[PDB]
mmCIF file of N, CA and C and ligand atoms in Angstrom:
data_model
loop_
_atom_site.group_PDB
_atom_site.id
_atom_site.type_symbol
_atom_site.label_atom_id
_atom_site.label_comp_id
_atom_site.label_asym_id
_atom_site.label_seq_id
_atom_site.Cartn_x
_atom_site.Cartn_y
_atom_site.Cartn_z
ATOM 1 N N UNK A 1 -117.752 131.452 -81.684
ATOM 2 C CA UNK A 1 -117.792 130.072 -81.206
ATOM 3 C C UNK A 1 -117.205 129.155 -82.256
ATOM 4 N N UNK A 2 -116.269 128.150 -81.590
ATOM 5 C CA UNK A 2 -115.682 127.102 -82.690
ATOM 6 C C UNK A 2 -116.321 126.062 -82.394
ATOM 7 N N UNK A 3 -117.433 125.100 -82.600
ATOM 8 C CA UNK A 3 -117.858 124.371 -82.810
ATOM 9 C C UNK A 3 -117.400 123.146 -82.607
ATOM 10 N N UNK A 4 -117.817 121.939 -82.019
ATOM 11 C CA UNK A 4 -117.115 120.422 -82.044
ATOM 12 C C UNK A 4 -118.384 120.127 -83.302
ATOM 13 N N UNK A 5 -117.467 118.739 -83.740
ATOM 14 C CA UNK A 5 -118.006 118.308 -85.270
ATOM 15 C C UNK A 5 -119.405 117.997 -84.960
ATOM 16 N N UNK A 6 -119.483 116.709 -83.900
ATOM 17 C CA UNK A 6 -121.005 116.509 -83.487
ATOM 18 C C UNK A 6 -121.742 117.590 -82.885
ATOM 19 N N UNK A 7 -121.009 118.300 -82.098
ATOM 20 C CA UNK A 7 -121.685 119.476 -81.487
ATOM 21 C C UNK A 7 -122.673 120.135 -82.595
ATOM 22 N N UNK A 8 -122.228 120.692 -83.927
ATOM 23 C CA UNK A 8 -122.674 121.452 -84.913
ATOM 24 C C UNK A 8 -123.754 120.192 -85.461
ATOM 25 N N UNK A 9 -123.435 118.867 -85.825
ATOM 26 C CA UNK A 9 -124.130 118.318 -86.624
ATOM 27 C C UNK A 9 -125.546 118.101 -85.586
ATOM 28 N N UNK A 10 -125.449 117.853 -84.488
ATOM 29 C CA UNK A 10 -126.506 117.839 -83.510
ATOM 30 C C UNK A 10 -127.512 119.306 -83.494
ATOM 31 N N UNK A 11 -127.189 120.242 -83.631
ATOM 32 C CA UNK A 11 -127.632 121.881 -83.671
ATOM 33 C C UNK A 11 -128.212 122.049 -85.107
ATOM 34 N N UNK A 12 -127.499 121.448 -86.271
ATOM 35 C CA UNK A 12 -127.914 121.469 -87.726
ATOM 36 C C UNK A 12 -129.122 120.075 -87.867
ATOM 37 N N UNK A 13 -129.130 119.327 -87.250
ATOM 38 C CA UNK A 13 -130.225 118.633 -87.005
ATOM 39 C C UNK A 13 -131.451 118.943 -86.373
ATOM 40 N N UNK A 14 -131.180 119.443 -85.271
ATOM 41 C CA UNK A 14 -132.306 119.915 -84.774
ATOM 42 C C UNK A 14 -133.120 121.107 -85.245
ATOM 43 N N UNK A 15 -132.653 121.903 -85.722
ATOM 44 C CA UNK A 15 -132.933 122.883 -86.868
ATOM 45 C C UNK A 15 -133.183 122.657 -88.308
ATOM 46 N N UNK A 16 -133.296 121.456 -88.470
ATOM 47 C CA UNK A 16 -134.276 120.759 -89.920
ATOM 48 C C UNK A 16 -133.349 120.750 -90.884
ATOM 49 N N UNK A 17 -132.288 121.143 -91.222
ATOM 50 C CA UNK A 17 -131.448 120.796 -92.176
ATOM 51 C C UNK A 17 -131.009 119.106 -92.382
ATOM 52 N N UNK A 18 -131.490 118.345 -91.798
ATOM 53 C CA UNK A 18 -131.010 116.473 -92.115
ATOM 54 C C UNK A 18 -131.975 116.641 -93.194
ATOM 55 N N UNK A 19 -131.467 116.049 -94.403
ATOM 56 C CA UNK A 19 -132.633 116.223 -95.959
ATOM 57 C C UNK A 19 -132.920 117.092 -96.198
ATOM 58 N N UNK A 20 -132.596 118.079 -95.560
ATOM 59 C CA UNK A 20 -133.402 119.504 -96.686
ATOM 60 C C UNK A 20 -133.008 119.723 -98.083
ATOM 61 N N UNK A 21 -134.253 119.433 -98.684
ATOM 62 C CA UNK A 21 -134.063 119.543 -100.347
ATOM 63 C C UNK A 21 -132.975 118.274 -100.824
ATOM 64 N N UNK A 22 -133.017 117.244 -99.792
ATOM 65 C CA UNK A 22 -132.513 115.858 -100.113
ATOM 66 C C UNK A 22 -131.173 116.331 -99.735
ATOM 67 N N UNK A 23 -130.739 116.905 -98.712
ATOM 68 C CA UNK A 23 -128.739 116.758 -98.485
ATOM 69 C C UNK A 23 -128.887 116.375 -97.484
ATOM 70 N N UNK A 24 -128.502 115.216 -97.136
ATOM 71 C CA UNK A 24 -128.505 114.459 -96.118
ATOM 72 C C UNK A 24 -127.345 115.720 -94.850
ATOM 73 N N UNK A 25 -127.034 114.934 -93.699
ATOM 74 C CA UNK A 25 -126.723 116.426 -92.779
ATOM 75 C C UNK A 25 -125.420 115.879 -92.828
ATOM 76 N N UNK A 26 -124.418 114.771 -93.530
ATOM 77 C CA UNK A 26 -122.878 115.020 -93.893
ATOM 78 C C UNK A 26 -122.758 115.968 -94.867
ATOM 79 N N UNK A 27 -123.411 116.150 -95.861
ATOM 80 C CA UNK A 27 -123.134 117.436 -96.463
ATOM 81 C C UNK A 27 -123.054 118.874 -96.339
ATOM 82 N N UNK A 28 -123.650 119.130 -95.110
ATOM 83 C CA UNK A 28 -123.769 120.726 -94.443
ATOM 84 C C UNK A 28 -122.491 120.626 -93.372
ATOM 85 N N UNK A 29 -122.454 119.250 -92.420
ATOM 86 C CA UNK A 29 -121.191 119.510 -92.123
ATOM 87 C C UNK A 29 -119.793 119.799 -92.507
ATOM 88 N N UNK A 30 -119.765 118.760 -93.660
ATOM 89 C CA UNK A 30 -118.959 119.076 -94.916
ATOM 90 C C UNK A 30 -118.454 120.785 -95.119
ATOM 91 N N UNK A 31 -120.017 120.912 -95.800
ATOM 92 C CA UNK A 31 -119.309 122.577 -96.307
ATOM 93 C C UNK A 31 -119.132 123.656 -94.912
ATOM 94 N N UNK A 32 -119.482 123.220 -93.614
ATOM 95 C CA UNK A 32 -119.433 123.962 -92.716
ATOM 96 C C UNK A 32 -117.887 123.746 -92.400
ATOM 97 N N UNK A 33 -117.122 122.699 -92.494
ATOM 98 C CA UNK A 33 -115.839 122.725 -92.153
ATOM 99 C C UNK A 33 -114.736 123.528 -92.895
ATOM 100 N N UNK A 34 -114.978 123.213 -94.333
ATOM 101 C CA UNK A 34 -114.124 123.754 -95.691
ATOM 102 C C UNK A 34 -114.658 125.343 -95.552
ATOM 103 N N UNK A 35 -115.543 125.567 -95.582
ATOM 104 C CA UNK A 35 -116.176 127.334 -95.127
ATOM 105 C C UNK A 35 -115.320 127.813 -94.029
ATOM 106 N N UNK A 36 -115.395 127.331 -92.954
ATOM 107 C CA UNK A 36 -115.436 127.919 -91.812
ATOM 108 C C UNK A 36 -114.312 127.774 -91.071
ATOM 109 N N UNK A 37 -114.171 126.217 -91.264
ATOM 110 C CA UNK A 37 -113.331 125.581 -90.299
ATOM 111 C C UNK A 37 -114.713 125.356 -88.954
ATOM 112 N N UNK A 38 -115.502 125.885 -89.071
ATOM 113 C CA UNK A 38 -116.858 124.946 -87.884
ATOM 114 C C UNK A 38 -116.341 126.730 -86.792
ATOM 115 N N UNK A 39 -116.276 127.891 -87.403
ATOM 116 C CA UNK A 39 -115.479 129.058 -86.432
ATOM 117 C C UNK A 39 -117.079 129.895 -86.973
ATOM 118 N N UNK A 40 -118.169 130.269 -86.167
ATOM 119 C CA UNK A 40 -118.922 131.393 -86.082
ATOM 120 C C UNK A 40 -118.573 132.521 -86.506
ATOM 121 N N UNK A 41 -116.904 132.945 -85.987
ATOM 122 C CA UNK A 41 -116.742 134.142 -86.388
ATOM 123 C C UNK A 41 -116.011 134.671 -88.022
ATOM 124 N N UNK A 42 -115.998 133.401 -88.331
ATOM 125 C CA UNK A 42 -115.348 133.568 -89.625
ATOM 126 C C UNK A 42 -115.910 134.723 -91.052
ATOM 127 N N UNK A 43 -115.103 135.208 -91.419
ATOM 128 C CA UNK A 43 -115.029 136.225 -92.675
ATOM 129 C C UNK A 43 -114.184 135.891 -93.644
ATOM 130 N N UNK A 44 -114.276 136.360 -94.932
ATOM 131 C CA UNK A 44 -113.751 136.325 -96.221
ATOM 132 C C UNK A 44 -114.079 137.790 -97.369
ATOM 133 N N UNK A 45 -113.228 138.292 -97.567
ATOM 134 C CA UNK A 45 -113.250 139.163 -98.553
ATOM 135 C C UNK A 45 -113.376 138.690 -100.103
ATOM 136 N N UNK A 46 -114.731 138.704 -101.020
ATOM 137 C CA UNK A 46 -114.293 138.117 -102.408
ATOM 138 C C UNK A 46 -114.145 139.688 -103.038
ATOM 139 N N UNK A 47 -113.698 139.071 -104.772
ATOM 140 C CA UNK A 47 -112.904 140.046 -105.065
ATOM 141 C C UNK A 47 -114.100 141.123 -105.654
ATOM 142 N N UNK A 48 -115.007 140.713 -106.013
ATOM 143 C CA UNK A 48 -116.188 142.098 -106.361
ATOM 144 C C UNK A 48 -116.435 143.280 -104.885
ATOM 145 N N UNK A 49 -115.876 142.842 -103.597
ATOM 146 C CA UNK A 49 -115.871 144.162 -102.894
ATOM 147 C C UNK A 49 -117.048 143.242 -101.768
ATOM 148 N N UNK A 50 -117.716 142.150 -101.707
ATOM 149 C CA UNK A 50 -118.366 141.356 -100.912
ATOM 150 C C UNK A 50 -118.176 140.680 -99.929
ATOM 151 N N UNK A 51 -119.106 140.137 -99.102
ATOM 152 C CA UNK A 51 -118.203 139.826 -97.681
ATOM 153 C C UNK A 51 -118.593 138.554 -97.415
ATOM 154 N N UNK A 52 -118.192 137.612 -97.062
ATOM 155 C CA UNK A 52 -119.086 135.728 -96.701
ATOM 156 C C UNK A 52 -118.823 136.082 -95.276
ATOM 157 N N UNK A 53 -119.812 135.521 -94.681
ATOM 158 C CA UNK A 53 -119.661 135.392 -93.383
ATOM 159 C C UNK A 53 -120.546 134.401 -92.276
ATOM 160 N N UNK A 54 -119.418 133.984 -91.165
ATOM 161 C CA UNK A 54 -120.482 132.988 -90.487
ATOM 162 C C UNK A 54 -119.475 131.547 -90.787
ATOM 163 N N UNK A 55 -120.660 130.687 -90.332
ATOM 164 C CA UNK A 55 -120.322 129.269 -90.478
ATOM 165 C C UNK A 55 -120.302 128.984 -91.659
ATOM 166 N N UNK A 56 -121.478 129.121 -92.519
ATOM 167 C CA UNK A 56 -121.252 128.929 -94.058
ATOM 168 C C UNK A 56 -121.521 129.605 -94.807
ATOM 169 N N UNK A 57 -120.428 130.810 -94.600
ATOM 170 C CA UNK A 57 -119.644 131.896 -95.461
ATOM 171 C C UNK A 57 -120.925 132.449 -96.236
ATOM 172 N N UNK A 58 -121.989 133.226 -96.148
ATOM 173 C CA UNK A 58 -122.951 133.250 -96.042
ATOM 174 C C UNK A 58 -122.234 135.047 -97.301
ATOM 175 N N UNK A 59 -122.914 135.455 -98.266
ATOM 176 C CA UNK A 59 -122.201 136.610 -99.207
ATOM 177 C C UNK A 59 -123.222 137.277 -99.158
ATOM 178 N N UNK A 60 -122.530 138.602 -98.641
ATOM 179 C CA UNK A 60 -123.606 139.812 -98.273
ATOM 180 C C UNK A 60 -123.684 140.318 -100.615
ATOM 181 N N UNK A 61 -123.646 139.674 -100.865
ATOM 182 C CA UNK A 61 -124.005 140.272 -102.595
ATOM 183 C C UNK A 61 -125.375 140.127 -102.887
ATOM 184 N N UNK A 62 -125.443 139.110 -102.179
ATOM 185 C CA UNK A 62 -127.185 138.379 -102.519
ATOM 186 C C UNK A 62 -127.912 138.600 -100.881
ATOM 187 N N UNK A 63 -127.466 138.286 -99.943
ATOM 188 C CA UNK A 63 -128.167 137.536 -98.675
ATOM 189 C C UNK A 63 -128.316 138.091 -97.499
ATOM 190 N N UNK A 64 -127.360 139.347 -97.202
ATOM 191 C CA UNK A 64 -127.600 140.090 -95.664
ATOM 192 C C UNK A 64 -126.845 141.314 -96.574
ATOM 193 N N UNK A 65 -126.847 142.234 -95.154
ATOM 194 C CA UNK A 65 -126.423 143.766 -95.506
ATOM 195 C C UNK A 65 -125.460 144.188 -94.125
ATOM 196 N N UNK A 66 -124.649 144.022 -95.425
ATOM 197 C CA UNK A 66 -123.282 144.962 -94.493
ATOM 198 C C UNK A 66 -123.055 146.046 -94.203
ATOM 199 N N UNK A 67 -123.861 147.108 -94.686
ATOM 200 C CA UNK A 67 -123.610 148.222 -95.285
ATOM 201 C C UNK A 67 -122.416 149.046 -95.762
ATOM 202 N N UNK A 68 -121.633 148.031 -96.518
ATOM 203 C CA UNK A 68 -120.361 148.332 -97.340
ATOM 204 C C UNK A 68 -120.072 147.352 -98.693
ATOM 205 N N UNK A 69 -121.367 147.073 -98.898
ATOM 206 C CA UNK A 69 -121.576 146.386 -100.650
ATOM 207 C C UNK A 69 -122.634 146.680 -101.580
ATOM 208 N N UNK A 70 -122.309 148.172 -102.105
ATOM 209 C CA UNK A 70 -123.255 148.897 -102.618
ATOM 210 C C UNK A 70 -123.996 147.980 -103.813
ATOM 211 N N UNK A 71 -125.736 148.402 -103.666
ATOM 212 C CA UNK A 71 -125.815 147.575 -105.226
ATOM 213 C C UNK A 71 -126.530 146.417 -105.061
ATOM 214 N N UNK A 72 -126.273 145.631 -103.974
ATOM 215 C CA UNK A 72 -126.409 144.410 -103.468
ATOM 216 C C UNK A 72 -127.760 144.069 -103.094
ATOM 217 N N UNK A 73 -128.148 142.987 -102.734
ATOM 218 C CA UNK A 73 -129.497 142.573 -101.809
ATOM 219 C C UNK A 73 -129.550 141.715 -100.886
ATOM 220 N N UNK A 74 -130.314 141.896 -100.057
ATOM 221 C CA UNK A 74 -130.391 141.468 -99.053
ATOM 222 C C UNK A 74 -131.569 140.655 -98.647
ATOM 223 N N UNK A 75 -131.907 139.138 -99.654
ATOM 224 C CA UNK A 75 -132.674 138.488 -99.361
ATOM 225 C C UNK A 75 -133.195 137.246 -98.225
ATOM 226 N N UNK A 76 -132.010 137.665 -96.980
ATOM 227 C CA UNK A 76 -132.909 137.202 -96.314
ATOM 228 C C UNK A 76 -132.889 138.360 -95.058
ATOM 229 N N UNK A 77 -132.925 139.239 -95.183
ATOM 230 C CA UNK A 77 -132.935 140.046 -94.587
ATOM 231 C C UNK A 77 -132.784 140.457 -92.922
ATOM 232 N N UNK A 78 -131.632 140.269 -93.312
ATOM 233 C CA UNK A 78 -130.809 140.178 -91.929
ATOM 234 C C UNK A 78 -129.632 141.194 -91.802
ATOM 235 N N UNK A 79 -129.045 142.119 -90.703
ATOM 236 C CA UNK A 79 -127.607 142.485 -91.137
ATOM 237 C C UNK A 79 -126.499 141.186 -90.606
ATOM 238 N N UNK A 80 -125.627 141.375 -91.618
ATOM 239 C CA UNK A 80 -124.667 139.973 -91.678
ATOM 240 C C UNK A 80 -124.010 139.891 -90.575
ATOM 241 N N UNK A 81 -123.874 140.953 -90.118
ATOM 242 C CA UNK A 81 -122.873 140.539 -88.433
ATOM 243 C C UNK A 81 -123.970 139.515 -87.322
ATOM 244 N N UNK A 82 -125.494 139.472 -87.973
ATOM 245 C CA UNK A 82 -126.068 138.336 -87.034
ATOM 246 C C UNK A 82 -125.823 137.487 -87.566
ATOM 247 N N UNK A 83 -124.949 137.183 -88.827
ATOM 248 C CA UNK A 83 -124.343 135.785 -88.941
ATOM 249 C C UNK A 83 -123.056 134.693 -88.412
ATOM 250 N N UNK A 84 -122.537 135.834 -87.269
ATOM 251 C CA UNK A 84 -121.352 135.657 -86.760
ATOM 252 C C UNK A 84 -121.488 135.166 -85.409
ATOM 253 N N UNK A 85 -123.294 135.327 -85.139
ATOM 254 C CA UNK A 85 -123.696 135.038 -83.321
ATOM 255 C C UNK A 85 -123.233 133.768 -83.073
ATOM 256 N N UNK A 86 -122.546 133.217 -81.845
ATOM 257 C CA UNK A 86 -123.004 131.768 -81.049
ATOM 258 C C UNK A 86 -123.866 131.063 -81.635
ATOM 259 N N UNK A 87 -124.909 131.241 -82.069
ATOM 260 C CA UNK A 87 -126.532 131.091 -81.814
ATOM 261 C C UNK A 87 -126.600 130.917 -83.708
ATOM 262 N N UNK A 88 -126.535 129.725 -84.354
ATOM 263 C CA UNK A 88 -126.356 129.491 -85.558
ATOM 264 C C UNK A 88 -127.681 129.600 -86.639
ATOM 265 N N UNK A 89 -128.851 129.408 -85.562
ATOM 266 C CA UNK A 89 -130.138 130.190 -86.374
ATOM 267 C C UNK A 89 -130.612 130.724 -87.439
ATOM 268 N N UNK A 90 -129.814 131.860 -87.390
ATOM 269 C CA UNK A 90 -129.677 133.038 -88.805
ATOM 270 C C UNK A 90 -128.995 132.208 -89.651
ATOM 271 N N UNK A 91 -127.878 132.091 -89.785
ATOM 272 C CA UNK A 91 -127.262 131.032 -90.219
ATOM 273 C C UNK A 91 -128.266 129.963 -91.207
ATOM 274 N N UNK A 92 -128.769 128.917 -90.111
ATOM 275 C CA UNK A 92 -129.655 127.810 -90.425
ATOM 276 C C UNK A 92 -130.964 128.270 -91.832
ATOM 277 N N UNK A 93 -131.405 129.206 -90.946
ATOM 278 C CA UNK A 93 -132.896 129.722 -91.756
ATOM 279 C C UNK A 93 -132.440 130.050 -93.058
ATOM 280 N N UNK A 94 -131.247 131.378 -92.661
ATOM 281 C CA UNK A 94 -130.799 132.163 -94.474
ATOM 282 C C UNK A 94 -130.116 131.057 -95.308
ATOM 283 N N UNK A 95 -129.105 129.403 -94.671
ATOM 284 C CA UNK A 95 -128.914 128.459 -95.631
ATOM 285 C C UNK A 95 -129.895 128.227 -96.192
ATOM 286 N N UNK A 96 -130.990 127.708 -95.701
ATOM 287 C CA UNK A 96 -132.117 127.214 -96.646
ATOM 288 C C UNK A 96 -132.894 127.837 -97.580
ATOM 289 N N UNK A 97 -132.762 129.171 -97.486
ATOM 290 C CA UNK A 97 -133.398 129.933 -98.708
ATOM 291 C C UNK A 97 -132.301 129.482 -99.817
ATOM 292 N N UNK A 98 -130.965 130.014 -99.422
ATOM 293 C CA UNK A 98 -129.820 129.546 -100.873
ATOM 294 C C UNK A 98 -130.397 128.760 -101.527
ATOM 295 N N UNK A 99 -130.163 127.436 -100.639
ATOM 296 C CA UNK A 99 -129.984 126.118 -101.067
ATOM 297 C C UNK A 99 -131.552 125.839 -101.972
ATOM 298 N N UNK A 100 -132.338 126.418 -101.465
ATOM 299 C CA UNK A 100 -134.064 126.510 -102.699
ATOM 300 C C UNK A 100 -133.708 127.314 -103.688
ATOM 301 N N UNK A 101 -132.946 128.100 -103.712
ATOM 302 C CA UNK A 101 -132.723 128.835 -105.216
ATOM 303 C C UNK A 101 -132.595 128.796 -106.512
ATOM 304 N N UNK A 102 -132.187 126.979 -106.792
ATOM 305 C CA UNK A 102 -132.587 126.113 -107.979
ATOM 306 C C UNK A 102 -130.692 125.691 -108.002
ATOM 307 N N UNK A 103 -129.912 126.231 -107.332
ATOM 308 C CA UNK A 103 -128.962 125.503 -107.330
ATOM 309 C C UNK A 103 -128.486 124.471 -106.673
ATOM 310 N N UNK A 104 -129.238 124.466 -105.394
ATOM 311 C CA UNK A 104 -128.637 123.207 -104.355
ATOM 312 C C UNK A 104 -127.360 123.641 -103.353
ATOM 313 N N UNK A 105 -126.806 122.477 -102.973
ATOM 314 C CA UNK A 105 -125.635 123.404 -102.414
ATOM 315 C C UNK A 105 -124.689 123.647 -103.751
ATOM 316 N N UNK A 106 -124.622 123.749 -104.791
ATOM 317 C CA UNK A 106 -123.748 123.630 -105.894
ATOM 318 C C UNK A 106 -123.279 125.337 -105.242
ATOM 319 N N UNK A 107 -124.047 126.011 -104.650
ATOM 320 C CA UNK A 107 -124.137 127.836 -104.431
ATOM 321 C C UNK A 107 -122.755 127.541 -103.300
ATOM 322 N N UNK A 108 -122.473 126.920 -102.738
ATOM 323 C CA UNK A 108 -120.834 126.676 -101.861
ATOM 324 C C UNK A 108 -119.982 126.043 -102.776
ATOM 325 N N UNK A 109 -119.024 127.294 -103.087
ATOM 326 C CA UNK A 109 -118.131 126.462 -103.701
ATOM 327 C C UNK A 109 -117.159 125.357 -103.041
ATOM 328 N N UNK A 110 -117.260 125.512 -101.861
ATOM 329 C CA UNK A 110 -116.237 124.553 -101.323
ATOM 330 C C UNK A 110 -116.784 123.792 -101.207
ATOM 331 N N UNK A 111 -118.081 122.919 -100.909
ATOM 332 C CA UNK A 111 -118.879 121.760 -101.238
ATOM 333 C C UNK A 111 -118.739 121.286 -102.120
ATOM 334 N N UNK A 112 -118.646 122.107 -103.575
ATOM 335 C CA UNK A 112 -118.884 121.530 -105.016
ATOM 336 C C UNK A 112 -117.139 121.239 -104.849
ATOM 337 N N UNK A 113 -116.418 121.388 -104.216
ATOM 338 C CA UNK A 113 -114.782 121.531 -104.550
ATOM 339 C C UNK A 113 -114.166 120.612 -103.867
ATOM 340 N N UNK A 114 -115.282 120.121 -102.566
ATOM 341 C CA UNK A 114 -114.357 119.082 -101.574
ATOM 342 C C UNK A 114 -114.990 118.515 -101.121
ATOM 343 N N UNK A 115 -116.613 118.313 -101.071
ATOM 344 C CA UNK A 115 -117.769 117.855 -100.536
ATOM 345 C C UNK A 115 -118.610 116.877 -101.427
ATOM 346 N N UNK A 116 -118.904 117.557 -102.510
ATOM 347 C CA UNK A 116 -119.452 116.852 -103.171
ATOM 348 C C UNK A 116 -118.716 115.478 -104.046
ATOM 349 N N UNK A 117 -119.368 114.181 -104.274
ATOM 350 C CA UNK A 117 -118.869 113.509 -104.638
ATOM 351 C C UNK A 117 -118.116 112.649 -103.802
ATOM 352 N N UNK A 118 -118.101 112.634 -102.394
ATOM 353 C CA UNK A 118 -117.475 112.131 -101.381
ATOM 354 C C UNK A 118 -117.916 111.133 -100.405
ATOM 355 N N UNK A 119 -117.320 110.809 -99.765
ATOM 356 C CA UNK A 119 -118.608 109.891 -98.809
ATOM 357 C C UNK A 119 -118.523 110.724 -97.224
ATOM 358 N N UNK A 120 -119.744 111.711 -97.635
ATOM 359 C CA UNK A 120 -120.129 112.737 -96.947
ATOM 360 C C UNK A 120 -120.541 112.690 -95.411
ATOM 361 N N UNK A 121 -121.175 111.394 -95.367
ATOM 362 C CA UNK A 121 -121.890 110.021 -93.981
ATOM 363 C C UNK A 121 -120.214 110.351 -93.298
ATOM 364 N N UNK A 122 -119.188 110.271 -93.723
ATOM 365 C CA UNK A 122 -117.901 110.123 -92.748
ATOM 366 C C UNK A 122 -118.061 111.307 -92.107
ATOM 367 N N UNK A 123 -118.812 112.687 -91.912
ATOM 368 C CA UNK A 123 -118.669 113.736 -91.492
ATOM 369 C C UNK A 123 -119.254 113.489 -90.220
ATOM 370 N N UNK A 124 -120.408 112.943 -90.004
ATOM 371 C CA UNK A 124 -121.091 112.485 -88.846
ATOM 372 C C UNK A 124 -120.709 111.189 -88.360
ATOM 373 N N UNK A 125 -120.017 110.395 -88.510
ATOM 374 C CA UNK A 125 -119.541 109.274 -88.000
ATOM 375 C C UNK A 125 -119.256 109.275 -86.690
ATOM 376 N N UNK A 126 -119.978 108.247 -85.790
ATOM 377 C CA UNK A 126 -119.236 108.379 -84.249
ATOM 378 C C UNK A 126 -120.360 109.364 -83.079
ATOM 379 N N UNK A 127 -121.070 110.489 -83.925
ATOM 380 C CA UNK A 127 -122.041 110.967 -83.278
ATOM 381 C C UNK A 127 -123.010 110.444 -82.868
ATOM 382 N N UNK A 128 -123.840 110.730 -81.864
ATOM 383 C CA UNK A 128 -124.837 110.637 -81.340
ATOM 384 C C UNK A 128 -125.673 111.026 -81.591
ATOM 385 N N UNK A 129 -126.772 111.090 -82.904
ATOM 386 C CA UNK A 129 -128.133 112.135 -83.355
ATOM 387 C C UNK A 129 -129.218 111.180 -83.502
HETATM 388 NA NA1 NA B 1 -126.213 142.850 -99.308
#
């Protein structure tokens, strides 16, 4: 599923991410665009042999199990292809463990690279929430 901008920010709202751990919900749209492009089915190969996946590129090193990243963990314990569903959920729940991990979103690099520092409120502009 490719996502419309409000479409996602309406779904990431209702699922408790507006303020979680103080990021207002232009910032998740933010890194959901630069991640993803706002595409469910999206993947990325990094170079240790790991996989991001989902809306926000979600890295089976730490967070789901691919079973092709030996070594790894799988703290929120999920296999990562349920990060690719319609149904952004998995997604929602396993962001918010990251984001408590003591880094914030600083853990997306494309947030810290194109998000952060921005006027983030323009991501939701025009919506209805
Ligand atoms: Na893993």
């Amino acid at each position: 599923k490719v996502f419309g901008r409000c479409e996602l920010a309406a779904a990431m709202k209702r699922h408790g991410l507006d303020n979680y751990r103080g990021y207002s919900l232009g910032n998740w749209v933010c890194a959901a665009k630069f991640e993803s492009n706002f595409n469910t089915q999206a993947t990325n190969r990094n170079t240790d042999g790991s996989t991001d996946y989902g809306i926000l590129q979600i890295n089976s090193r730490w967070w789901c199990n691919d079973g092709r990243t030996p070594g790894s963990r799988n703290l929120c314990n999920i296999p990562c292809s349920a990060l690719l569903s319609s149904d952004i959920t998995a997604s929602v729940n396993c962001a918010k463990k990251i984001v408590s991990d003591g880094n914030g979103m600083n853990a997306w690099v494309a947030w810290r690279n194109r998000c952060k520092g921005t006027d983030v409120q323009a991501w939701i502009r025009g919506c209805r929430l």
